[PDB]
Design an enzyme around this catalytic site. Sequence first.
Site, mmCIF file in Angstrom:
data_model
loop_
_atom_site.group_PDB
_atom_site.id
_atom_site.type_symbol
_atom_site.label_atom_id
_atom_site.label_comp_id
_atom_site.label_asym_id
_atom_site.label_seq_id
_atom_site.Cartn_x
_atom_site.Cartn_y
_atom_site.Cartn_z
ATOM 1 C CB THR A 56 -0.938 0.051 1.211
ATOM 2 O OG1 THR A 56 -1.839 -1.061 1.161
ATOM 3 C CG2 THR A 56 -1.733 1.348 1.215
ATOM 4 C CB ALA A 80 -11.471 -1.113 3.644
#
EC number: 3.4.25.1
Lengths: 199, 86, 228, 239, 201, 230, 248, 238, 213
Positions: free
Chosen positions: E1, E49
Amino acid sequence: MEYLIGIQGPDYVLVASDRVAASNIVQMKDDHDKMFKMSEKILLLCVGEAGDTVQFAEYIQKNVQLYKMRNGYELSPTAAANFTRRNLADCLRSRTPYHVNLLLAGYDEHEGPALYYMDYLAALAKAPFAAHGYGAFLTLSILDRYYTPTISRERAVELLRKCLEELQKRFILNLPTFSVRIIDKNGIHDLDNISFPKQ
Amino acid sequence: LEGRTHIFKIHARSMSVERDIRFELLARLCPNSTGAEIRSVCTEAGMFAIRARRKIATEKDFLEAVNKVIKSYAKFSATPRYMTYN
Amino acid sequence: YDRGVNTFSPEGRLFQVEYAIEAIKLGSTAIGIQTSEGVCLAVEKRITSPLMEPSSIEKIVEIDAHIGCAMSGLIADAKTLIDKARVETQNHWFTYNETMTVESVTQAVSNLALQFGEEDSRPFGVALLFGGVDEKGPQLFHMDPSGTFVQCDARAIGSASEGAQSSLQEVYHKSMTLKEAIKSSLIILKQVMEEKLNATNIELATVQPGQNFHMFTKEELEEVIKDI
Amino acid sequence: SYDRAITVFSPDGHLFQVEYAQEAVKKGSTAVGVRGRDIVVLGVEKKSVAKLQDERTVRKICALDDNVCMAFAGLTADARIVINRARVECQSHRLTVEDPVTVEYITRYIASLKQRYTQSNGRRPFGISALIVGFDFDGTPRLYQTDPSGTYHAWKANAIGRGAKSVREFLEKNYTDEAIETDDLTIKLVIKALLEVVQSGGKNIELAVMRRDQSLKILNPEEIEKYVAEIEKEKEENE
Amino acid sequence: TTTLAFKFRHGVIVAADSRATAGAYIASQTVKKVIEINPYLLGTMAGGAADCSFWERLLARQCRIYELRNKERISVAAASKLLANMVYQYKGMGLSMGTMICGWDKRGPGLYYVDSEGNRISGATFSVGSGSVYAYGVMDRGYSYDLEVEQAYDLARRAIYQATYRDAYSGGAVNLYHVREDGWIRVSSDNVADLHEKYSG
Amino acid sequence: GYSFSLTTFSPSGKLVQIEYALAAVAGGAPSVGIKAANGVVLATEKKQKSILYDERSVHKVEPITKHIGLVYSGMGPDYRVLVHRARKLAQQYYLVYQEPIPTAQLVQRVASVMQEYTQSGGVRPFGVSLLICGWNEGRPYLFQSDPSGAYFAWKATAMGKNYVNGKTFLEKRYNEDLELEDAIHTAILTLKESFEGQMTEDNIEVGICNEAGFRRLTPTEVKDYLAAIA
Amino acid sequence: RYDSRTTIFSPEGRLYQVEYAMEAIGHAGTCLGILANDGVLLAAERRNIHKLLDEVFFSEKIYKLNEDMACSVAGITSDANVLTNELRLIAQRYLLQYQEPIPCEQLVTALCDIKQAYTQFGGKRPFGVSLLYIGWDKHYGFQLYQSDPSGNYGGWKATCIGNNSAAAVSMLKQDYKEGEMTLKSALALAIKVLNKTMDVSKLSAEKVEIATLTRENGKTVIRVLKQKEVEQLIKKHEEEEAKAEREK
Amino acid sequence: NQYDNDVTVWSPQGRIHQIEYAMEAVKQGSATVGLKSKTHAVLVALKRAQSELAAHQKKILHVDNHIGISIAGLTADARLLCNFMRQECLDSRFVFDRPLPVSRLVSLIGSKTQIPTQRYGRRPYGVGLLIAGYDDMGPHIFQTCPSANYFDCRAMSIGARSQSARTYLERHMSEFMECNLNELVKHGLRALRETLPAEQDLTTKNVSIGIVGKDLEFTIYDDDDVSPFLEGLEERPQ
Amino acid sequence: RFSPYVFNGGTILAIAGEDFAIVASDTRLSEGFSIHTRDSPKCYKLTDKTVIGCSGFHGDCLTLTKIIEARLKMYKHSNNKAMTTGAIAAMLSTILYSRRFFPYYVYNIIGGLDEEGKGAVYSFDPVGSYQRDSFKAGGSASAMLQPLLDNQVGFKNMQNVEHVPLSLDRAMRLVKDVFISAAERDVYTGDALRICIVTKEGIREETVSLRKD
């Protein structure tokens, strides 16, 4: 952690903060400001929990301006300091306390300039000079050494130059750029940003 | 509404007007009225037809006739002067 | 008599939403027409002052990118309904990734159309015209302050609404076209208005399938004015 | 219905106490205000000095933000509540949003607040009517009026108080926006409005201007007396 | 990420990867981390998320409320502000969110950086994620304000290539959006292996 | 959820039901209260309606503190409630300050309470004026309240039937400097001034407030004194 | 069927209750504040001058509120006593907030809002009490203000009570003093005001009251003065009546 | 008359007539008929319009797969108790995971409406609910009232001039138990046609038809399966 | 003390076909070292073009399922029509966020057809993020299945291998082979297989047995 300085003079308040907004590894930002124009003769400096800083600047800054528009004239720096320390004292014994460390820089037409210093435990203080962070030790010994109560502002500038030069000597962090204000009979005047060539 | 248009026809043909105008707008302007009051409207448009030299009565002579009789003659001359609606 | 929202008649109820039905007619008129080509709509502004800025007066708002509106009489309760409606359609997209259907929009407003209550506030004074294009295409909807909603094919409201509906029924049919309904609509408008029709008296509201967006005409409006 | 509380609609569908509150507005003192192209301006009449008081406390004009200027009609204490509430509100907008507080937002706040105030039970509605001038969005001059119903409405000029139809009728006879934005015609325009005051007393006239970037500029009734002097001088030039 | 964004003379460059793992296990490689807020606003998924998905959706909701009420497009700073207000109300309650806020202002380019710790700041270059320090390395190497469009494309694309190359947690597709004055513009989305065969020579 | 007052002004400006409450007070009973140089003597003349009633049950002279005695002007069933209020309030002072409350504090607080009861309307105002006494810090005191929330202060003060007659009889009879037995002397002199002829040990009932404190007297010593107290 | 009006307009454009509150104001005693630069005074009228009282209160109209501020009063007593407890709660609350006393006006506006909340709603009787305001600050010095039941407040130099004081206000417009801060000029002046307007024969001291509020070295002391100097003010003022009858 | 204004105040004849006034508000609605066989329950209502261009207003609406109701009179109370209705359907349908017996549900409706018929501060409800349901023992036709004295029947009809249809039901209640769905339906519109003035005929768009069965889900129709039900009819005996 | 969460087993496969959606899941239900039953279909036919598979904590699957069906009735009886698949993903995702601080121990995959009548898979997580992909396998054998699907559906890591669109019966064979192969190695998998097929013409079910240990 980081540093600012709040030297009180006879008729002037000389302050200087950093521009650093690092996050634990890198410096994300080298043009930050922590100098908060509360009114035309009263300023605020703050180092603490960065979430609490902004919200606290909202409440205190906008609340002072609500007083200023409301009655029509500026607070004393003293009862403003008691107001803010009051707000920390209310905020602490609660489900959400704040952990910030403060100092105020007021000016009166009657009392002249005024210097206050807060805590993360809501302590009132009246100082000739005040600072925060780990650098405050190494600075305030020197500032204790070459202090004059009735000193000109240019000697304060030069002693600030000296103190910053010793700050690049035995301090572990970077800290390149220090912004400076000055208070007078008129009010807030921004002096130049202070940085240094190291080698 | 339309009985009032019929009385508009009655007191319209019985006087010198202009035959190029309408009256359903006036029947909208008359919620509750008698045909005698309609005759007062037609004579009042006659009064505006006296002020100006009119014998073929325009629509506006009837417009100021109704705005006279129902509005500028209800109590004084001021039932409106607030928008709040439109 | 029947001096409240809690005391019926020996015949009917407490005609006070009925008093608001009386309070609709004092408002200016507006005409919506559902053509299969699209739902078009217009209104009369009734500008009073030269200082009275015309675009400060709103009658058609954009609820959704294919959903417009039209008010009656009192403005501010309607503005509350507009804010609520955009909130609730935003909830429908927020929880469904899609537009609330204009019927369910209208019923969604129509739930608290009568949720007036001063204990356990007052009723409202505005009839509403809704234009949308759902999956069934063009939709023209009309409700009341009592929330008793029915779909209309071409509804006229406000002052002088009687002969507007009657002369509407003279001119309306199912196989109409859009600009025909536009020029016919403003024919009825200059029949029922008292001022000379210009750019400032009226405004348009035109939703289409291919032109879901822009329920409005800008100065083309002036051209359609000089086209009649 | 009767002549009673706010809930009842009339048999012809009306709310009597609304216009009854509009009476105390209509039976209030007169104030005017016009927007300049840059220097917006206003002024109240009927200072009515009673020889034994201070008048900084009776000053009917203040600000909420530095872009906006306050005026009202009707009674005073309700307007004091609206002023303090709106100081808290514009300060709250200032806290939430870091933009100069706009006129349209705060007027929606005020007129909305009077509306939901009006709908509630046994709460006597605010019998005032405010006049709101601001020039923020690129200094664009704006003035909105209010209502005891709570309908804010954009105008280009305004006059209130007892006999506002006369003064506004003069402004229709004085609506000369072709003279560009020569703030001299703003000065002589306010001098024309105070000239068209119901008394035009010369000493009971108060005026305040703003160049859309400055603060509120309170005038002096000797420069304003010079404005009445050039006003009567131009009136001599009319003959 | 690892995500990044930077504004310059010709607007804002928005670059991100698409690798989402579950600890040591790859969930997917096709994860649109740049949450497209508006035709005029774009946001990132930087930590959390459904925090970024939910809270940025609610902010898109709220800006829609603002522009419907005020008939007027929102500033970037106010949206970042109210985002920080909404995140602050759950401070210390265990939420990860360090996203970036990108858009265009009447003042011009709009770039803000808001964290779960109330670290709402502006700035010119940002990069969040595990190998974000790599992107400050190669990006802050290749940074100028007066770059061109394809220059910034291959710069940020190269930077994502290095970051995903060195991190074990970064990869998937390379999403590249470009915010302009009028509104944002999608540029491309490229595989790491394609930029590997391309960029190795 | 009623009570958004009940009281409106008269077109004169006055408040009618309060004046009718004063009518309810003045249309009642005559009793007497006299402040002496050392203590304060309060006295009633409590005759039963029948020949059956026990006078050892209900007691008009009631202490609130051990140095504070008090009587009222009106009905018992109100009086027990507001007594209970004043008792608890004095307990609140003693819980805060650990000190015996000065009488003027009960005047301000209890008078403000009754002023509140005049305020709203779903309830009547209490038709009672109080006669309060206590020998606080050297000086004894004698305070006369009203139903309408105010208060007064008298060297001696009575109320009810022939209140101007007994009041002038105190104005003529009594003076500045007396003693306790002198105050009981002129108190019986103004008691039998408008009472009935049948006045026994159980009809009259006296409570005094020495500087040593309140003392509710018994019909023993009342029978010892008022057996032809002149 | 039980709402009197409690919150309503006249069917025209006025207010029902506030007029009658002003009808309750003028039937009371009379106070005044004077134009003085070095302190300020107040004169009051002893209602209920019956002789069998105690008079151990040392104040009946005056209520020294914080340290350097007091107030007269006119109207229903204990309602205003609630307003004094509330007022000292508010200014003393402000002192708790800042360790600074009030700037003496926003207190008054606050209390005007307090009465005003009863004017709009609450379904109740508002306070028909008007009263005075004296004090000193760092920004205007000694100050004079007047409360209203209307929620208005007057920034005064010479105040007003009802029918007993209308001719007093005509006298103050007739005897406006200016520049002289000498308190005894206001003492003989107010002795002329209560000498005429009060119907007390020869201005007895037991029917009147005087209290001043003077700056003293950083204390701003308040003089609730005794009665013997009031007596020599009576003899001095009747000596000024002898000076008035020199012209015969 | 001064007593006959509110809910709480008993009449000197004992009859607090506001309930009767709500009954009259029910009588101002359209007529409708509910009926059942032994196996199949059909309820048919009358659509009416406001104008010609406007659509015809419906009364029959779905609630549950085994629950059908018609309505007449008020709408806000009707949709209110519709949301309460479907609400309770998904309540015990959620918790007990069973379809509802009709009687306990309608008992909750009458108890639900008891409080606004009792306390001061609440109005009675203009309600014309006709009820067809399927518990274990098959079809049920309940009717309601603003007095909350709900009745069970085999067939009812409420609204304007429904009494002619009531006479039709009485002279054909023997017919209704045995015949199956289609001819029972045309018995139904041979009840609605007598509530019509005889100068006009029951058209397509003016009628609503709902059928629920022991094996048939409650389903409503308009102009489409209605035209197969609109055929096979006799004309009015002029 | 009381633990709120426990693992029940499960394995879900969904494949978005070209105009179909194949959702299969085993029927074995167990805990710890005890089998509760061999018959528990985790597939739930929501509409004619939407079937959900749910794994993880079983009681939250039941509860949440009933909530979903209720809100289906809310949308339809409110709105006179059925939901789209992505609308179900939206509303479901809001429900998953609605218990943010007390989550479900539940994995969720929605299969079904779009408005174009093409395959549609929305994967889920126990917190509430989602997307539409081509194939997802949740549950215990999740990492047992994905790389073979990448070799087959995505044809990934393959040189000179063209991308044939996967037919129906080919995919059926793939499903049976992967449930055999994963059934050989997972302890939470076997004894039967519930197979669901979303066509544009209805949903077909098919039960294939597995090994009985």
